[PDB]
Design a protein around this ligand. Structure first.
Ligand code: ZN
Lengths: 4, 90
């Protein structure tokens, strides 16, 4: 997953 | 968010979770995350960290420790030793  | 402090509350937000995303609501809610209602965007109730673009094989606890290692909920659930390992400290 990738952060925001 | 205050209303997302419980696992059951976070599970209710996955009502419209897209069925094609390769990670399940139970895994996400256990690690503190609730669905914000857009695409596969989730947020932690404690640290407000957002995660998206979930991939096959992702472990929400590991992703939480990778990107938001200072989260107090994460540290209480999994321990500073776990978080340190994911951050490359042994
Ligand atoms: Zn968090």
């Amino acid at each position: 997953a990738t952060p925001f | 968010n205050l209303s997302m402090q419980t696992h059951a509350a976070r599970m209710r937000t996955f009502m419209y979770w897209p069925s094609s995303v390769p990670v399940q609501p139970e895994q996400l809610a256990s690690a503190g995350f609730y669905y914000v209602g857009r695409n596969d965007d989730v947020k932690c109730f404690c640290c407000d960290g957002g995660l998206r673009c979930w991939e096959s094989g992702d472990d929400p606890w590991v992703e939480h420790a990778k990107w938001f290692p200072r989260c107090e909920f994460l540290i209480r659930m999994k321990g500073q030793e776990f978080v340190d390992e994911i951050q490359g400290r042994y």
